[PDB]
Design a protein around this ligand. Structure first.
Ligand SMILES: *[C@@H]1O[C@H](CO)[C@@H](O)[C@H](O)[C@H]1NC(C)=O
Ligand SMILES: *[C@@H]1O[C@H](CO)[C@@H](O)[C@H](O)[C@H]1NC(C)=O
Ligand SMILES: [Ca+2]
Lengths: 81, 422
């Protein structure tokens, strides 16, 4: 599997980075949405994880969404593909 | 055969799951019929509990508790309580000398069981407390064949600290010797618990010097750090599913900096009953933090922070708070102070918690406390290593950098990468 491997990108920035995963690994996407001292900000992080488990949790006024993926270069935020 | 074992002063009471507090039935050496009367199950493993020094000459209240925990965990096993109370209620250096005779009585009893009923010594686990760990070790050295296990529960230190291997617990006494050191406070030879590693795996909870929940607020107060070794072991018997992890480290100081949180080739092990019976050339001295009460388990994290500034600033004895948020739960306002906080310098440190937060998501960092403008450091990333899960996690600032200002708003960091170490 090939996943996009990017650290905290601004909402409207595309991940140009990739990584061939290890065995049993899936594509994960972590989206953080919430208020900053620069306004309401959306970030996205992507990587090869050993066991991905989907979750949506509001943590101290920050919506944190983790999603999971089995197809190559599929860890793209919903607002991009 | 009773004539051949008449000189033995130690008594061997075979307790049951329904009757854990009293020495009701005795396994009398040389009287094979007593083994049947007490209903010893020849198909099951044997746990021999050996008490320590007793100022009152009667069982300390931990004995029915351990016996209860051993039958809960292993219901078909045999829990024998070794009674050497008269030898244990003497001036300490007298009682400490008696461990050689109690050891001899224990070995002769183990050998009589082997000889009379072909009982395997590979099915014998000796659990000795304080003076009892030394007598367990002396016993182990005198068996015809090695016993499978000896668990030393904070073995006694005075007169044993400089004692040679035949006179104390040593790794040679059983196939596997595991030790829990919980009251090593004092200078060598003047510490209640033994300081020196005496097993194959020597575990030092909270540095081993003293235990949490034991600062002030029969002689129960003076002994809780010593006796915590039994309760740490009881807790391991009661939680087979969630063992407490111990980590091999160069020193207790390096473990306090979060430097030793690795599981690669027995650098981590289970504290207690579920320990992986790994023998090594040199003993692995291991460390962990614990709670003050049962369930004792905590979660250990190493936190690495690079503090970036414009101008060259140095601040000493600075107090901070760290909040960790996961998928399961959270653990907020965890305090830690740093001796020096400099510009463009990285700091590592251990953070621990009783809370199972799960998989980390968010990290909040607060710098605790006009003639001067409040100092500050720009922080882009925080790396975290989780010992229990064996995961290297990276957190990065929500914006380009998270400004950490003294007495101001906390810096917020979200997870941007995960890696499994295995
Ligand atoms: C004796 O122990 C075995 C396991 O070692 C168990 O299967 C059996 O039920 C026990 N016998 C009695 C009398 O409980
Ligand atoms: C810290 O490093 C940055 C470059 O990464 C630099 O701009 C800044 O001047 C440095 N501060 C000091 C005092 O060295
Ligand atoms: Ca020995």
């Amino acid at each position: 599997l090939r996943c996009y491997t990017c650290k905290s990108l601004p909402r409207d920035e595309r991940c140009d980075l990739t990584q061939d995963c290890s065995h049993g690994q899936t594509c994960t996407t972590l989206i953080a949405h919430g208020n900053t001292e620069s306004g309401l900000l959306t970030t996205h992080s992507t990587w090869c994880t050993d066991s991905c488990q989907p979750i949506t949790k509001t943590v101290e006024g920050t919506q944190v969404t983790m999603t999971c993926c089995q197809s190559s270069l599929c860890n793209v935020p919903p607002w991009q593909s | 055969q009773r004539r051949d074992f008449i000189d033995i002063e130690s008594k061997f009471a075979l307790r049951t799951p329904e009757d854990t507090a009293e020495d009701t039935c005795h396994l009398i050496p040389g009287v094979a019929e007593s083994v049947a009367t007490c209903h010893f199950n020849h198909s099951s493993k044997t746990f021999m509990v050996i008490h320590g020094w007793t100022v009152t000459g009667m069982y300390e209240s931990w004995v029915p508790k351990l016996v209860a925990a051993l039958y809960k965990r292993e219901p078909d096993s045999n829990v024998i309580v070794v009674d050497w109370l008269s030898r244990a209620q003497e001036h300490y250096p007298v009682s400490a000398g008696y461990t050689k005779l109690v050891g001899q009585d224990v070995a002769r009893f183990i050998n009589w069981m082997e000889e009379e009923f072909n009982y395997p010594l590979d099915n014998v686990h000796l659990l000795g407390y304080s003076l009892g760990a030394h007598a367990a070790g002396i016993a182990g050295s005198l068996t015809n064949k090695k016993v499978n296990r000896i668990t030393g529960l904070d073995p006694a230190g005075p007169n044993f600290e400089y004692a040679e291997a035949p006179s104390r617990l040593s790794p040679d006494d059983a196939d596997f010797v595991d030790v829990l050191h919980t009251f090593t406070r004092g200078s060598p030879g003047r510490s209640i618990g033994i300081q020196k590693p005496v097993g194959h795996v020597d575990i030092y909870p909270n540095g081993g010097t003293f235990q949490p929940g034991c600062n002030i607020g029969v002689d129960q107060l003076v002994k809780c750090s010593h006796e915590r070794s039994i309760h740490l072991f009881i807790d391991s018997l009661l939680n087979e599913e969630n063992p407490s992890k111990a980590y091999r480290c160069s020193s207790k100081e390096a473990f306090e900096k979060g430097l030793c949180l690795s599981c690669r080739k027995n650098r981590c092990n289970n504290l207690g009953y579920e320990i992986n019976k790994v023998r090594a050339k040199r003993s692995s001295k291991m460390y962990l933090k614990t709670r003050s009460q049962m369930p004792y388990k905590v979660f250990h994290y190493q936190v690495k922070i690079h503090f970036s500034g414009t101008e060259s600033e140095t601040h000493t004895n600075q107090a901070f708070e760290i909040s960790l948020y996961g998928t399961v739960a959270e653990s907020e306002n965890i305090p830690f102070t740093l001796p020096e906080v400099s510009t463009n310098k990285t700091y590592s440190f251990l953070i621990y918690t009783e809370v199972d937060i799960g998989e980390l998501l968010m990290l909040k960092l607060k710098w605790k406390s006009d003639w001067w403008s409040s100092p500050g450091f720009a922080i882009q990333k925080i790396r975290v290593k989780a010992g229990e899960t064996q995961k290297k996690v990276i957190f990065c600032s929500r914006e380009k950098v998270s400004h950490l200002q003294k007495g101001k708003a906390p810096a917020v960091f979200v997870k941007c990468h995960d890696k499994s170490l295995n």
